[PDB]
Write a protein that binds this ligand. Structure first.
Ligand code: HEM
Ligand code: D0L
Ligand code: SYN
Length: 455
């Protein structure tokens, strides 16, 4: 009955920690899952977790009566600058449910209608950039997709223009963001984060937290002294009141939310768009089908909210890209009470789980033997997909609050991309996945041939 779960190779007192001493640790954990199966123990000094890779077990871990969201070490280090914003707070901290209640209406399908015009603004800047490239120039795909999604969250969220398409070199806030995210992730591997080798990293980390707080606090202060009532997240946050506590967010927590949304904008949707275009150029028949939908639906020079809603195949393209390469590749859980997982693995209250999403999405008992194939038609009927087989936005009440935002922006942009250009994988690009907070293709380049359709 009770099975003892495998564990990858250890390093004396360092346990399994040195296995994360790599620049692609998620992909390294995936290969361990290939070797060891649906569940394996992973220990570091002072920490134990268990990596889940099968739908059989993950469907139990997604039972919210038995498991709640845990902060991974990664999220604990990001909390150093994202605070108790939505993504780095515990479910039982008062500011989680309060910010959740206040911000839910800002992220609904209905709220998407109000953001649509300003996502079209940024999306048009992307298309015009590509229309203006010279023959036999190429597109740096993740770079441009990150320019897009950062600008979109800046504009839709806070009425601020990062003007990323006017730049080679990030806005100063983004420089500190990206550097702080890099330190947070690199910190995870250090066997001794106290060696003086890491003193400068420590110094630079604190400078970046200060640059980030000071610029956000200024934006908050400036908006409050202004009165301007633009329909953006910062206004809803300054004006909204939690129905439960009846309280609004305070300025410190609003700062944390803004940092949180900007991290999410920069990191996740740009990865998704990059992986989707990669899969489309590697699967020309799928690109054809999606381009045909784009041409048939996007019949005006600017897309409308209604038309984006009818880009249904583009949506399953995005879902299939999230299946093979979920850009936020894991989440962590803890047992609310003693419980037995899958009838085989007893857990005590407090025990942690890691959900390894890319491996879940390769569970052959779920998707069949063509699991590595890019086939958006898998998603034709969600009722034919078993429970909790597909988890790119997390689980339950702690699922991605920005899920509709991301899919509206990604659908609109990919739709316009397919309306306006033919794409050529001119380098026969070999997929290379760089890991930061999230997963992104690195070095992915294509050529676009304009269809010469006016905007
Ligand atoms: C396709 C792109 C995206 C993916 C794959 C994604 C995925 C996820 C996942 C897996 C989680 C749960 C993490 C955990 O349980 O520890 C999450 C949480 C979250 N995401 Fe997203 N996300 C995306 C886009 C966005 C965007 C655009 C925003 C907002 C601008 C956003 C805001 C959040 C927030 C605030 C949370 C924490 C929510 C809460 O716990 O209340 N995400 N996301
Ligand atoms: C927000 C985007 C997703 C971030 C998810 C984490 C993304 N990690 C980045 C590296 C792999 C992955 C992960 O498995 N992390 C674990 C690592 C860990 C486990 C046990 C002991 C020490 C450290 C953790 O952070 O605890
Ligand atoms: C820290 C921000 C964040 C945003 C989305 C998912 C996980 C983390």
């Amino acid at each position: 009955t009770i099975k003892e779960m495998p564990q990858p190779k250890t390093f004396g007192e360092l346990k399994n920690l040195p296995l994360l001493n790599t620049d692609k640790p998620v992909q390294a954990l995936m290969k361990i899952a290939d070797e060891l199966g649906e569940i394996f123990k992973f220990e570091a000094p002072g920490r134990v977790t268990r990596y889940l890779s099968s739908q059989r077990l993950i469907k139990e871990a997604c039972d919210e009566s038995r498991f709640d969201k845990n902060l991974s070490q990664a999220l604990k280090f990001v909390r150093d600058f994202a605070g108790d914003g939505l993504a780095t707070s515990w479910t039982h901290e008062k500011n989680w449910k309060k910010a959740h209640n206040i911000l839910l209406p800002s992220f609904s399908q209905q709220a998407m209608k109000g953001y649509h015009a300003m996502m079209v603004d940024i999306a048009v800047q992307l298309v015009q950039k590509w229309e203006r490239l010279n023959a036999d120039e190429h597109i740096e795909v993740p770079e441009d997709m990150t320019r897009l999604t950062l600008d979109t969250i800046g504009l839709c969220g806070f009425n601020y223009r990062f003007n990323s398409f006017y730049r080679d070199q990030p806005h100063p806030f983004i420089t500190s963001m990206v550097r702080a995210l890099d330190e947070a992730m690199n910190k995870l591997q250090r066997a001794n984060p106290d060696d003086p080798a890491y003193d400068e990293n420590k110094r630079q980390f604190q400078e970046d937290i200060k640059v980030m707080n000071d610029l956000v606090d200024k934006i908050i202060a400036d908006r409050k002294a202004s009165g301007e009532q633009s329909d953006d997240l910062l206004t809803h946050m300054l004006n909204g009141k939690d129905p439960e506590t009846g309280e609004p967010l305070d300025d410190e927590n609003i700062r944390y939310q803004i940092i949180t949304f900007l991290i999410a904008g920069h990191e996740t949707t740009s990865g998704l768009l990059s992986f989707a275009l990669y899969f489309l150029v590697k699967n020309p028949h799928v690109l054809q089908k999606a381009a045909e939908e784009a041409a048939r639906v996007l019949v005006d020079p600017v897309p409308s909210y209604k038309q984006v809603k009818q880009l249904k195949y583009v949506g399953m393209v995005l879902n299939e890209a999230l299946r093979l390469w979920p850009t936020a590749p894991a989440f962590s859980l803890y047992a609310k009470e003693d419980t037995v997982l899958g009838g085989e693995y007893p857990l005590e209250k407090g025990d942690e789980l890691m959900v390894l999403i890319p491996q879940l999405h390769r569970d052959k008992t779920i998707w069949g033997d063509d699991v590595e194939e890019f086939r958006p038609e898998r998603f034709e009927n969600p009722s034919a997909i078993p429970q909790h087989a597909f988890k790119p936005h997390g689980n339950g009440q702690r699922a991605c609050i920005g899920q509709q935002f991301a899919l509206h922006e990604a659908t609109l942009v990919l739709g316009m991309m397919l309306k306006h250009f033919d794409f050529e994988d001119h380098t026969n690009y070999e997929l290379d996945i760089k890991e930061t907070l999230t997963l992104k293709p690195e070095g992915f380049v294509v050529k676009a041939k304009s269809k010469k359709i006016p905007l």
